[PDB]
Amino acid sequence: QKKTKKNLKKFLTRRPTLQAVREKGYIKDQVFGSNLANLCQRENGTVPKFVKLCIEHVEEHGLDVDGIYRVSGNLAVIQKLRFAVNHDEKLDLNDSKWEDIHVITGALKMFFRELPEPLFTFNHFNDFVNAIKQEPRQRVTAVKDLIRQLPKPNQDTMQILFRHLKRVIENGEKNRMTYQSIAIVFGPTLLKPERHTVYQNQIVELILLELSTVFG
Amino acid sequence: TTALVCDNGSGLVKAGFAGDDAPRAVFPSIVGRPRSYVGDEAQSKRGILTLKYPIEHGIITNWDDMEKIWHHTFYNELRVAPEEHPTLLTEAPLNPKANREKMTQIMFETFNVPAMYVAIQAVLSLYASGRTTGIVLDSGDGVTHNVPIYEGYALPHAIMRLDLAGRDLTDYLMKILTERGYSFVTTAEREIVRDIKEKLCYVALDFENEMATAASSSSLEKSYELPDGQVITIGNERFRCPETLFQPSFIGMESAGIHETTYNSIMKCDIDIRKDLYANNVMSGGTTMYPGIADRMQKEITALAPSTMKIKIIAPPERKYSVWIGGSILASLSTFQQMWITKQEYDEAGPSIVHRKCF
Ligand SMILES: Nc1ncnc2c1ncn2[C@@H]1O[C@H](COP(=O)(O)OP(=O)(O)OP(=O)(O)O)[C@@H](O)[C@H]1O
Ligand SMILES: C/C1=C/C(=O)O[C@@H]2C[C@@H](CC[C@H](C)/C=C\CC1)O[C@@](O)([C@@H]1CSC(=O)N1)C2
Ligand SMILES: [Mg+2]
């Protein structure tokens, strides 16, 4: 025990940094927690494959479920989903291992939460908050033009995600979800400052509200 | 002055003081609310309460009950004031970011600790075995992980996770004991089977050969007396139950056994360090305590690895508390002093400071 404490004592001060170990290629990014542009490149796409899987599964089995994207799924099952996705294993989101629809929506909300940079990017956060503070007659134009300045992975993933959430609200009579409850869910996760929450929820509401003109 | 070390598992909480050779408190990780008590006091009143496991498969899934676990750990088990002790906690590999933030927020806002830190369970086991590079088989009550580590860094793309663990082995032993007319079903009956599993089960070196010897053997069958005085006997179920770890299809799983997930994890790492991983297989967790599991692993991995590779399984006798012992060593080092997340830092940054400081 004395020899191990001494070596640990010195190892702590001489341990290599995280970036040095990544320079060697020993630490590799997965699906969760990895840069969005790097993930889409490795998959030869502009939308993460797991994002497309969740949306297609929810639009086929969970569009009528009350309080979807608001009700939380089991965190342990989601963690099992993270490993199954991160290893590119044979995966069918309709299998009984994944329990219910809220595990799928919870894993989708987590994917955007775990992103190193927000979907709306760090360097455009100030512009988005300033665009939503403008006079209402000029907001939609300012939001659209900032979106057209984002990189292609962020543009494409934003459209597929928002068009999906639009159909969720359009079935609000069955699932009791509205523009406000959905924006409360995705507001803080899609827009973060590097370093307010009321303006972030307002940005997602506006995009969902004027979906047609914003992505024209 | 002296720091606290707390290893919150899916079944057991191990907590104590940094610098000690063993945890001072080991109590079950259950919370009971009436139809609130925690730990052993909740099991005594299992009829008045509805018991819940706040940790599921190594992941916190009930933050209300988890906050009660820590309150009990501080004031009832260790009998200390949290505002006076730095607190080192443990977590599962690739723990969701929101969970790491909620743990940091609770420790500082609810318990007012002067400093805190969270380390990866498998990393603390590797440290306890005097190593900073190797692959760890961490198998507890709720989850099993194969975590290859380089210089204290868990390699995330190569971490293997299996839902099969100790509790699932107890459930399987309950099932195969119906072949002897025993009917263990309820929660109280499950604790009897887990005790039999801990006392009499072992891993066979050759499972098919061990099956041919079972009838001819004179020493396989053992006796166990239940609380009410009745005596039961167990035969080849002593090693058919832990055989699930190597052949998970015994419980209907499609996953590979822990010997293959170890090999699959090593092969996902860079070829420059596979030799160092093959030679530093460290085992930790209660589910790795079966007699013979080290020799069986040594045999199964050699059959998978190239014939030229040197393979060594490290199964210390204290590996049931390896995670806590490593945390006790780490939090007591002087060179660890500047790594804590101080209270003054948290009040400025908030919970999200955990991602930069704890790695
Ligand atoms: N001698 C033994 N042989 C076999 N199994 C054992 C032995 N002792 C304890 N166990 C099993 O180990 C489990 C407890 O181990 P441990 O406390 O390390 O798990 P944990 O850390 O709470 O779980 P996790 O790491 O999954 O969160 C119990 O399920 C118990 O049945
Ligand atoms: C003695 C003991 C051992 C243990 O580790 O037990 C831990 C904690 C326990 C929680 C409920 C139990 C009724 C209360 C105390 C048991 C604690 O659940 C376990 O027994 C689970 C249930 S069956 C099993 O094998 N593991 C693991
Ligand atoms: Mg553990």
UniProtKB/Swiss-Prot annotation, chain A:
Site keyed Arginine finger: positions: R70
Residue ranges of domain Rho-GAP in the record: 34-215
Top-level taxon in the UniProt lineage: Eukaryota
Protein name according to UniProt: Rho GTPase-activating protein 12
Disulfide links within the chain: none
Signal peptide limits: none
Function in brief: GTPase activator for the Rho-type GTPases by converting them to an inactive GDP-bound state.
UniProtKB/Swiss-Prot annotation, chain B:
UniProt-annotated location(s): Cytoplasm, Cytoskeleton
Modified residues (ADP-ribosylarginine): R161
Species: Oryctolagus cuniculus
Subunit structure: Polymerization of globular actin (G-actin) leads to a structural filament (F-actin) in the form of a two-stranded helix. Each actin can bind to 4 others. Interacts with alpha-actinin. Identified in a complex composed of ACTA1, COBL, GSN and TMSB4X. Interacts with TTID. Interacts (via its C-terminus) with USP25.
N6-methyllysine: residues carrying this PTM: K68
Protein name: Actin, alpha skeletal muscle
The keyword Nucleotide-binding is assigned to this record: yes
Residues the record lists as Tele-methylhistidine modifications: H57
SMART domains attached to this UniProt entry: ACTIN
Record-level Gene Ontology MF annotations: actin monomer binding; ATP binding; calcium ion binding; calcium-dependent protein binding; cytoskeletal motor activator activity; hydrolase activity; identical protein binding; magnesium ion binding
Cellular component per GO, a single term: striated muscle thin filament
Designated gene of the protein: ACTA1
Class of this enzyme: hydrolase
Protein modification: MICAL1 and MICAL2 produce the (R)-S-oxide form. The (R)-S-oxide form is reverted by MSRB1 and MSRB2, which promotes actin repolymerization. Can be mono-ADP-ribosylated on Arg-161 by SpvB of Salmonella spp. This modification blocks subsequent polymerization and leads to cell death.
Catalytic activity: ATP + H2O = ADP + phosphate + H(+)
Gene Ontology biological process terms from the UniProt entry: actin filament bundle assembly; actin filament polymerization; mesenchyme migration; positive regulation of gene expression; skeletal muscle fiber development; skeletal muscle thin filament assembly
Keywords: Acetylation, ADP-ribosylation, ATP-binding, Cytoplasm, Cytoskeleton, Hydrolase, Methylation, Muscle protein, Nucleotide-binding, Oxidation
Note: In vertebrates 3 main groups of actin isoforms, alpha, beta and gamma have been identified. The alpha actins are found in muscle tissues and are a major constituent of the contractile apparatus. The beta and gamma actins coexist in most cell types as components of the cytoskeleton and as mediators of internal cell motility.
Family stated for the protein in its record: Belongs to the actin family.
Primary localization class, coarse: cytoplasm
Region named Interaction with alpha-actinin: 94-107, 342-354
